[PDB]
């Protein structure tokens, strides 16, 4: 008696520590898997997550407190812990039993003839708590005696005030035996027996006989196996370039030919009753050439090379495959697992396209294993304790003189029953790791240039970004950290907010037209015109849109604005607004390259750009042209530029106006006419331009916003002063990669005007709408494999 207690105290405290550590680690890792890995949410696995909660709340609260008791030799706590900890254990046991029952019933539904899942989780927790409430409101602290030394004890009060609690105390043991141990086993056995009978009588011969007839008909040599030639015997499959991969996936054992069992298994992947997971796993294994369980760069490249043909170059295809790998690698191992694959292509709904008329099962192995393992673990953990309780109920008798050995047996059995019940709340992660392949892979992933520049890499000790590092990285398709990009864009907006409406710029000066996200062409422009380290620049606007590298242009231009705020000048374009950016590809550019917060920061910076410049007291530089509401420079200087450009007013006229088609030779005297092409602003005339130039004493006006084949255009020469009145500059070579035009840049120095031309430069290719290769390819894979399976089986 005394010796057993003294020996088992150490065992109990070691058990408590071990359960503490293992339960915390395992349940935390399991919940992490549930809430980071996107595939795990699809099934009833979130019920498993609830079980983790049903353990964690018990482990971190109830276990340590008991530890103190194990070294207190008495009861040191008050009514609060005496009422709290057993409530926690009853709540946890109720959570576990209800979760197992509900999950078993749910998948009995699943294999036989969601909001309901969340409602079921809530109902499970509410019922567990309400059923554990009587236990909590039951206990009390009483000090009666210990034959001389009074001591307090936490237990059921021998007398209860209410009749309900008297009934509870009378038959508490059988209530705990029935609802918590008899009901779970009974329900799970009943539903598993029903599932066994379901697969029993639902088994038939019709589909099997028809598939056997098709197998025999296809088997030309009557060898019982299907080779490549027998599959190619159908003329309809000679035009499908996904034949060999599907033939390989049907061959599970890797012997080169498909037998009847493998034929049935391969066909069953496309049943009307199959789950989305089976279709997505088929899609993954299509690219998984060597069946290592992971998609790598090379295998994906070869698969899409076979699919596409010669439509695309090798270099651009390799670049976009590398891009897909980089974006889809959530753990940095250089390869794409199934988990990441279905996190990527989960929303394409291509699984619904791979539909064939068949009904066979290859599933029901894994998850049935898991659920039976969980129920068996629960049954085995509370089995010794119940056996000890029933042995005490039946054979124990204090009146028997031969009683000491009965104590020596019952106490040790009770110790074992307590310890095993404790270990159960820290064994579910281990059970899942040992029984389930998906859970084991997920735990293995968790427990065990794509480099992103940080603030210490971009900003020096003085807060000035190093332009060369950003330059090289953004040249090499590199990306930036969210914090660094947001910092750059926000404080660039802060710098630009301080500039006036109309900038005073003196010679020498370099003026460039529309860039439209052509980062490599922007590189060629800076190379031709000279480095910004010693050259003043005036960009007329349109830094984004129509391109696939706009965020790079934004980052680099506002980066130079950080470094060179006073030698670099930027003017607003019409494409930096809500409407045009959401209409064109810039929004998806920000969504794929970064987060939407980067988009918001970029738009806020766009809102702060100046509008126009006064160059050398002779010239006026804008993006579009004149307005009927603008007669003097004072009208431009009073504009509120820190807003969305409205559909009407000097804002829209400055950002959208274009000259007439016959500028310089217009038939009438109308200064301004309606602008149908843009849908807003107005066409302005040579008389209007001369009026504005003479009235304000300006010599010429520089603009952008019209495509030019030569990259520049001087309009009609002015009569009074003899200088070209309006000059349009375009600096986006190969605009939209279909125009094949040139680009020009305007240099003014020593009263000398020189226009320098440059052409397009190579840039990496992107699929339309910034998608990865998997989103590009999945529907075609699904359609061709479905057509193959329909041509073979259905006939």
């Amino acid at each position: 008696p005394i010796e057993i207690k003294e020996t088992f105290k150490y065992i109990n405290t070691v058990v408590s520590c071990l359960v503490f550590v293992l339960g915390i680690i395992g349940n935390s890792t399991l919940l992490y898997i549930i809430y980071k890995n996107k595939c795990m949410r699809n099934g009833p696995n979130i019920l498993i997550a609830s079980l983790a909660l049903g353990d964690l709340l018990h482990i971190v609260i109830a276990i340590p407190i008991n530890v103190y008791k194990l070294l207190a030799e008495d009861w040191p706590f008050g009514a609060e812990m005496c009422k709290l900890v057993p409530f926690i254990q009853k709540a946890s046991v109720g959570i576990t039993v209800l979760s197992l029952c509900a999950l078993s019933i749910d998948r009995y539904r699943a294999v036989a003839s969601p909001k309901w899942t969340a409602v079921e989780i809530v109902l499970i927790w509410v019922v567990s708590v309400v059923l554990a409430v009587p236990e909590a409101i039951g206990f009390d602290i009483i000090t009666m005696d210990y034959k001389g030394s009074y001591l307090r004890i936490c237990l059921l009060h021998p007398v209860q005030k209410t009749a309900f609690m008297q009934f509870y105390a009378t038959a508490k043991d059988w209530w705990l035996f029935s609802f918590y141990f008899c009901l779970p086993l009974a329900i799970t056995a009943f539903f598993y027996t029903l599932m066994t009978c379901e697969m029993l009588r639902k088994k038939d011969a019709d589909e099997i006989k028809r598939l056997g007839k098709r197998f025999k008909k296809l088997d030309l040599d009557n060898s019982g196996s299907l080779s490549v030639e027998e599959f190619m015997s159908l003329p309809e499959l000679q035009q499908n370039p996904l034949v060999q991969r599907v033939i390989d996936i049907f061959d599970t054992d890797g012997n080169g030919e498909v037998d009847f069992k493998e034929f049935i298994e391969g066909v069953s992947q496309f049943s009307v009753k199959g789950d989305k997971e089976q279709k997505l796993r088929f899609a993954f294994r299509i690219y998984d050439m060597d069946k290592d369980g992971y998609i790598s760069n090379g295998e994906l490249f070869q698969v899409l090379k076979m699919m596409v043909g010669n439509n695309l170059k090798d270099t651009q295809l390799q670049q976009i495959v590398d891009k897909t790998i980089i974006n889809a690698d959530k753990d940095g191992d250089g390869r794409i697992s199934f988990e990441e694959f279905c996190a990527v292509v989960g929303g394409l709904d291509i699984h619904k396209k791979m539909v064939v008329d068949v009904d066979h099962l290859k599933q029901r192995r894994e998850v049935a294993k898991t659920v039976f393992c969980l129920v068996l673990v629960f049954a085995l953990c509370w089995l010794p304790l119940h056996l000890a309780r029933i042995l005490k109920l039946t054979l124990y008798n204090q009146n028997d003189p031969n009683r000491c050995e009965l104590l020596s047996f019952l106490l040790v059995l009770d110790y074992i029953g307590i310890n095993m019940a404790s270990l159960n709340s820290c064994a579910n992660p281990i059970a899942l790791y040992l029984v389930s392949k998906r859970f084991k892979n997920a735990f293995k992933s968790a427990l065990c240039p794509s480099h992103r520049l940080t603030a210490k890499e971009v900003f020096d000790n003085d807060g000035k970004p190093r332009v060369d590092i950003l330059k090289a990285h953004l040249m090499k398709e590199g990306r930036l950290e969210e914090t660094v990009a947001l910092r750059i864009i926000t404080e660039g907006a802060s710098i630009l907010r301080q500039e006036k409406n109309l900038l005073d710029i003196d010679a020498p000066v370099t003026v460039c037209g529309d860039i439209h996200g052509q980062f490599f062409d922007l590189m060629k422009l800076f190379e031709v015109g000279g480095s910004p380290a010693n050259t003043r620049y005036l960009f007329l606007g349109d830094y984004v849109d129509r391109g696939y590298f706009s965020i790079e242009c934004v980052l680099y231009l506002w980066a130079l604005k950080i470094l060179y705020p006073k030698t670099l000048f930027l003017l607003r374009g019409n494409h930096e607004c809500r409407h045009l950016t959401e209409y064109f590809t810039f929004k998806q550019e920000c969504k794929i390259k970064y987060s939407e917060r980067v988009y918001d920061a970029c738009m806020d910076a766009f809102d702060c750009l100046p509008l126009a410049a006064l160059m050398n007291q002779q010239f006026l530089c804008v993006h579009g042209g004149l307005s009927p509401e603008i007669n003097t420079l004072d009208d431009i200087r009073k504009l509120d530029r820190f807003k969305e450009p409205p559909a009407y007013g000097p804002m829209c006229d400055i950002l959208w106006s274009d000259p007439l088609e016959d500028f310089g030779n217009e038939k009438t005297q109308e200064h301004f006419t309606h602008n149908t092409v843009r849908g807003c602003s107005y066409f302005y005339s040579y008389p209007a331009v001369c009026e504005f130039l003479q009235h304000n004493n300006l010599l010429s006006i520089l603009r952008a916003h019209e495509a030019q084949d030569a990259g520049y255009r001087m309009y009609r020469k002015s009569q009074t002063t003899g200088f070209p009145s309006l000059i349009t500059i375009f600096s986006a070579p190969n605009y939209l990669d279909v125009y094949n035009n040139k680009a020009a840049v305007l240099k003014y120095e020593n009263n000398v005007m020189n226009i320098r031309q440059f052409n397009c430069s190579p840039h990496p290719y992107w699929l339309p709408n910034f998608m990865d290769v998997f989103t590009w390819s999945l529907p075609f894979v699904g359609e061709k494999v479905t057509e193959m399976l329909v041509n073979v089986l259905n006939l």
């Binding site: 009861w75 900890v85 057993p86 004890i153 936490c154 237990l155 009770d414 307590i418």
Partner: peptide
């Protein structure tokens, strides 16, 4: 456990 004593435990108290 399933005894009478100075503990709260699953069925009854523990020694």
């Amino acid at each position: 456990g399933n005894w009478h004593g100075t503990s709260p435990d699953w069925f009854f108290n523990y020694y």
